[PDB]
Scaffold this active site. Structure first.
Site, short mmCIF file in Angstrom:
data_model
loop_
_atom_site.label_atom_id
_atom_site.label_comp_id
_atom_site.label_asym_id
_atom_site.label_seq_id
_atom_site.Cartn_x
_atom_site.Cartn_y
_atom_site.Cartn_z
N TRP A 79 0.69 -1.30 0.10
CA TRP A 79 0.12 -0.05 0.06
C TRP A 79 0.71 1.35 -0.07
CZ3 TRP A 79 -4.61 -1.45 -1.35
CH2 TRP A 79 -5.05 -2.81 -0.95
N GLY A 113 -6.86 5.85 1.47
CA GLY A 113 -5.91 5.83 2.47
C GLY A 113 -5.79 6.87 3.20
N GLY A 114 -7.20 7.16 3.76
CA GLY A 114 -7.45 7.99 4.88
C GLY A 114 -7.18 9.55 4.48
N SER A 195 -12.42 3.00 0.25
CA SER A 195 -12.10 3.71 1.62
C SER A 195 -12.38 5.12 1.44
CB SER A 195 -10.64 3.39 2.07
OG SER A 195 -10.56 2.92 3.18
N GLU A 322 -13.71 -5.83 7.90
CA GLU A 322 -13.36 -4.36 7.56
C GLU A 322 -12.36 -3.71 9.04
OE1 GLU A 322 -13.67 -2.42 5.02
OE2 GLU A 322 -15.48 -3.19 3.97
N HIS A 433 -9.80 -5.24 5.12
CA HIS A 433 -10.42 -4.06 4.53
C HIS A 433 -9.50 -3.68 3.18
CE1 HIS A 433 -11.29 0.22 4.39
NE2 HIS A 433 -9.92 0.65 4.29
C1 LIG Z 1 -6.75 1.75 2.87
N1 LIG Z 1 -5.93 0.99 1.92
C2 LIG Z 1 -6.91 -0.24 1.53
C3 LIG Z 1 -6.10 1.65 0.67
C4 LIG Z 1 -4.95 0.86 2.37
C5 LIG Z 1 -4.90 -0.27 3.54
O1 LIG Z 1 -5.80 -0.16 4.37
#
Ligand SMILES: C[N+](C)(C)CCO
Ligand SMILES: *[C@@H]1O[C@H](CO[C@@H]2O[C@@H](C)[C@@H](O)[C@@H](O)[C@@H]2O)[C@@H](O[C@@H]2O[C@H](CO)[C@@H](O)[C@H](O)[C@H]2NC(C)=O)[C@H](O)[C@H]1NC(C)=O
Ligand SMILES: *[C@@H]1O[C@H](CO[C@@H]2O[C@@H](C)[C@@H](O)[C@@H](O)[C@@H]2O)[C@@H](O[C@@H]2O[C@H](CO)[C@@H](O)[C@H](O)[C@H]2NC(C)=O)[C@H](O)[C@H]1NC(C)=O
Ligand SMILES: *[C@@H]1O[C@H](CO)[C@@H](O)[C@H](O)[C@H]1NC(C)=O
Ligand SMILES: *[C@@H]1O[C@H](CO)[C@@H](O)[C@H](O)[C@H]1NC(C)=O
Ligand SMILES: *[C@@H]1O[C@H](CO)[C@@H](O)[C@H](O)[C@H]1NC(C)=O
Ligand SMILES: [Cl-]
Ligand SMILES: [Cl-]
EC number: 3.1.1.8
Length: 523
Positions: A79, A113-114, A195, A322, A433
């Site tokens: 990631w 990616g938040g 996400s 999740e 997730h």
């Molecule tokens: C949120 N992403 C899936 C993009 C990264 C791992 O959590």
């Protein structure tokens, strides 16, 4: 070949895919690099060039902190950015079927990616399979994340907030004005993301400025109504100021604060973003979307509740587990290297990590709702995961779907429950997730890697996603497949996605979500 775009010519590269060919244009600029005086400002129009711009490789990824919790582990490193970081990162990619299509539907990906991390060049966002297999054009873009992308000083053009969302919008505009030249239909554009990507898609449905830039939407594990998706004007202010102090940029004049911050190096800004919040969680979104009065004209919840959004079809869904992924980034007793059997005491400490500013009563109410054991050593381990997943993703997604459908449009909801055979994470974490993504992009269609069952599943999802984009109906009409029913506020039917047998079910997490959606908001 060479395609002539509004701002100049661009050269792509041919790719061999499944005994066929896909044309890729990687790294097309769509905006003026947001450097210097342009840092923190909305993206500016690009200047026409001459010569041939070579879009033959992924461009720079936007500045961001990286996940260093598991060096050398593919589970987390898959990631992390796989391209040089830089403020000069406003580029997009285009994959088109070969031979050139005549009026192909366009799928635009927005990574998650938040709102702090992510990039379009990841191995799992490669759109060549979709272009090859379904003959759609796939587009993805890099948008600013973190403070460089969402720092907010409401009303101030030096740092208005939501800049990353405006980056996304500028890219959608680019498609509107240029995709025809690539053989794409600007009238058939479906946005899809995961996400924070999904949360962004849901916000484009609410932003008047984005209304005419797309047709339909797909939301994978995310929606703006998620507790981590929108920063309050209060939090935003305290955070902008905290960042100022930490960098010695505190000043009486707010615009002077920005000018000061415009002299700091990207690294100093990135280094201090983490500490702008007194106590964060592994899901913290230090700098995210805000009600800026421009992109977002009012609290999004109000807009959703009162039907103020683009009327169209939506495809929404979530994964079975999740919450697990976040448990190993702070929860006591958890580890990707053992079965993580935790105790009541650890579960309780766990809630502290995930619900920092919540009253003692609020945390007890979570424990009461999730600890009514139906014995088993993994009760608490599984309960904390469901707690994090239901609160942060599943319940908000369902509520979003229910509220959106209440205004007339067809909505389809899925429950992804297949665990990749290649998942690097331990079995206890289950269907994680972010791990339905590789199936949506068709990676399992490539035999050189996944089981046969996985090829079949991915092949169906791809077909369903494509049919949704093209026809607004996620069906797989040829191989005697289960019909995907529309999701209505009453029956609330949803489709399960797995290799075994796909089923039509009703009222997902009914009991759990009544708790999060109705009760918890009060504490
Ligand atoms: C949120 N992403 C899936 C993009 C990264 C791992 O959590
Ligand atoms: C709003 O911000 C204040 C200040 O935060 C502190 O200073 C920042 C620059 C950054 O370094 C943060 O990590 C600091 O916490 C918050 O007040 C802090 O509250 C905590 C409570 O645990 C306390 O320990 C600190 O001493 C306080 N900071 C100071 C020096 O006042 C405040 O909590 C934030 N508002 C919110 C959203 O609660
Ligand atoms: C599962 O592992 C956690 C994490 O501990 C670390 O990783 C382990 C695989 C091993 O390498 C340890 O030496 C590492 O510290 C264990 O949690 C720790 O448990 C001890 C005692 O209970 C406690 O003092 C630590 O604070 C815990 N650390 C954390 C991050 O919570 C846990 O006990 C293991 N559970 C098992 C074996 O089922
Ligand atoms: C673009 O690619 C062409 C063909 O490979 C090459 O001739 C040209 O120099 C490139 N332009 C650059 C590197 O600026
Ligand atoms: C593509 O289809 C649209 C309708 O969705 C039509 O209006 C447009 O003219 C077509 N583009 C082409 C092939 O010229
Ligand atoms: C439909 O079935 C055929 C053969 O039975 C298979 O090759 C193909 O991948 C399936 N198509 C979809 C969209 O699942
Ligand atoms: Cl690394
Ligand atoms: Cl089926």
């Amino acid at each position: 070949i060479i395609i002539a775009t509004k701002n100049g010519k661009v050269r792509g590269m041919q790719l061999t895919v499944f005994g066929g060919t896909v044309t890729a244009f990687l790294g097309i600029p769509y905006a003026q690099p947001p450097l210097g005086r342009l840092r923190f400002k909305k993206p500016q129009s690009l200047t026409k060039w001459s010569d041939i711009w070579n879009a033959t490789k992924y461009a720079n990824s936007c500045c961001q902190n990286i996940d260093q919790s598991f060096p050398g582990f593919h589970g987390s490193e898959m990631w992390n950015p796989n391209t040089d970081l830089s403020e000069d990162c406003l580029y997009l990619n285009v994959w088109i079927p070969a031979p050139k299509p005549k009026n192909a539907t366009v799928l635009i990906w927005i990574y998650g990616g938040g709102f702090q991390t992510g990039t379009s060049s990841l191995h799992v966002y490669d759109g060549k399979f979709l272009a090859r297999v379904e003959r759609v054009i796939v587009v993805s873009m890099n948008y600013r994340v973190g403070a460089l992308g969402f720092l907010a000083l409401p009303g101030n053009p030096e740092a208005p907030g939501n800049m990353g969302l405006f980056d996304q919008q500028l890219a959608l505009q680019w498609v509107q004005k240029n995709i025809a030249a690539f053989g794409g239909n600007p009238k058939s554009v479906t946005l899809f993301g995961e996400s924070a990507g999904a949360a962004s898609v849901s916000l484009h449905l609410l932003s008047p400025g984005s209304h005419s830039l797309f047709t339909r939407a797909i939301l994978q594990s995310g929606s703006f109504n998620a507790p981590w998706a929108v920063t309050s004007l209060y939090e935003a202010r305290n955070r902008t100021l905290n960042l100022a102090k930490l960098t010695g940029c505190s000043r009486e004049n707010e615009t002077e604060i920005i000018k000061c911050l415009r002299n700091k190096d990207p690294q100093e800004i990135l280094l201090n973003e983490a500490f702008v919040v007194p106590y964060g969680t592994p899901l913290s979104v230090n700098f995210g979307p805000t009600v800026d009065g421009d992109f977002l004209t009012d609290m999004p919840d109000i807009l959703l509740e009162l039907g103020q959004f683009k009327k169209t079809q939506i495809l929404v869904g979530v994964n079975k587990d999740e919450g697990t992924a976040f448990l190993v980034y702070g929860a006591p007793g958890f580890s990707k290297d053992n079965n993580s059997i935790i105790t009541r005491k650890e579960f309780q400490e766990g809630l502290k990590i995930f619900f920092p500013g919540v009253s003692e009563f609020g945390k007890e109410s979570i424990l009461f709702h999730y600890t009514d054991w139906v014995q088993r050593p993994e009760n608490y381990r599984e309960a904390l995961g469901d707690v994090v997943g239901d609160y942060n993703f599943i319940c908000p997604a369902l509520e979003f779907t229910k509220k959106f459908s209440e205004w007339g449009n067809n909505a389809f909801f899925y429950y992804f429950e297949h665990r990749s055979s290649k998942l690097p994470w331990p079995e206890w974490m289950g269907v994680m997730h972010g791990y339905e993504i590789e199936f949506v992009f068709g990676l399992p269609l490539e035999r050189r890697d996944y089981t046969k069952a996985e090829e079949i599943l991915s092949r169906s999802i791809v077909k369903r996603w494509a049919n949704f984009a093209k026809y607004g109906n996620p069906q797989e009409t040829q191989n005697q497949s289960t019909s995907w029913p529309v999701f209505k506020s009453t029956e609330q039917k949803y489709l399960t996605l797995n290799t075994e047998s796909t089923r039509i079910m009703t009222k997902l997490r009914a009991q759990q979500c009544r708790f999060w959606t109705s009760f918890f908001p009060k504490v």
